[PDB]
Design a binder for this molecule. Structure first.
Ligand code: NA
Ligand code: NA
Length: 327
DNA sequence: CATTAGA
DNA sequence: TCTAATG
């Protein structure tokens, strides 16, 4: 956590680099397990050798450990950091739409800068057009103060269209968070669950609603169960307009909400942990259900969930307010 | 890890 | 169809 730090940090820098600038999935994956393992290690790694005894700890990495140990640096690290090309890839990637693959290809052609990107908005697809457009607003944090604003409105039309809908705004937002990156609406309806062959409209109707009023301003992607877009809070009585916000709304069988909700609310640690517990407690937890464990090794049969509680109760735990789902 | 664009 | 990008 801090004794293993530099090494893990360097190693991660290292993986990441292969993965993006290069297309070295393997090495990348090498750097990572190592980074994983050296990380677990209970002692100060004092040399490559010591490190090396580890699993996944090859000669190439160990070698890298020494140089890092001896001098507070690493050439290859220094070299890459410098690399205008590699820098370019890292950068372009921030555009929402742009991944490593496109990142390379773009560079290839010579689009390294934002400006470049613009000059060639044609080379870009709708997703990346928008990504490009709201580049600033997309990088910006979301004050909870706004979160409430957005949350508010959302619930309004939701109910507006059909009183029957149920939306929850999952994430850190839900976990008290002074700020969030994007809003996550989990949605369901009773007229939709596990079997009941959809009602795509269900998603549709609302998106439409949200748009109708001007909350939704752009569609990044809309499928029959996962809408991915942009939104914005009415710019008041002028002088102050709102940043374009990332928004995602997903449909869900009313028969899987709570777990889903449970789940997407986190935190990542709380989940894991809770999850780990449900195991002792003879269960199985996952994004959609909760199954009773059978001795043979495994088992099925999704226990019925009406609220975040049911799940709790099931595993017989203390209902934890989202507030304190921190871990 | 599953869902959507796209080509 | 596969292959990329999101989360
Ligand atoms: Na080894
Ligand atoms: Na990106």
């Amino acid at each position: 956590e801090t004794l293993n730090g530099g090494i893990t940090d360097m190693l991660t820098e290292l993986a990441n680099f292969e993965k993006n600038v290069s297309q070295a999935i393997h090495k990348y994956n090498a750097y990572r397990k190592a980074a994983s393992v050296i990380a677990k290690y209970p002692h100060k790694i004092k040399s490559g050798a010591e490190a090396k005894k580890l699993p996944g700890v090859g000669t190439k990495i160990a070698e890298k450990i020494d140089e890092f140990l001896a001098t507070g640096k690493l050439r290859k690290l220094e070299k890459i950091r410098q690399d205008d090309t590699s820098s370019s890839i890292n950068f372009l990637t921030r555009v929402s739409g742009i991944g490593p693959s496109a990142a390379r290809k773009f560079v290839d052609e010579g689009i390294k800068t934002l400006e470049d990107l613009r000059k060639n908005e044609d080379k870009l697809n709708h997703h990346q057009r928008i990504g490009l457009k709201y580049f600033g607003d997309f990088e910006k944090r979301i004050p909870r103060e706004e979160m409430l604003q957005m949350q508010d409105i959302v619930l309004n039309e939701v109910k507006k269209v059909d009183s029957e809908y149920i939306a929850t705004v999952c994430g850190s937002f839900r976990r008290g968070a002074e700020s969030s990156g994007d809003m996550d609406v989990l949605l369901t309806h009773p007229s939709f669950t596990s079997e009941s062959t959809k009602q795509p409209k269900l998603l549709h109707q609302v998106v439409e609603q949200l748009q109708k009023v001007h909350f939704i301003t752009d569609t990044l992607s809309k499928g029959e169960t996962k809408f991915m877009g942009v939104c914005q809070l009415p710019s008041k009585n002028d002088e102050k307009e709102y940043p374009h916000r990332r928004i995602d709304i997903r449909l869900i069988p009313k028969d899987q909400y709570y777990c889903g909700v449970l789940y997407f609310t986190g935190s990542d640690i709380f989940n894991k942990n809770m999850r780990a517990h449900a195991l002792e407690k003879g269960f199985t937890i996952n994004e959609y259900t909760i199954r009773p464990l059978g001795v043979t090794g495994v088992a099925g049969e999704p226990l019925p969930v009406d609220s975040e509680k049911d799940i709790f109760d099931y595993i017989q735990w203390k209902y934890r307010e989202p507030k304190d789902r921190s871990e």
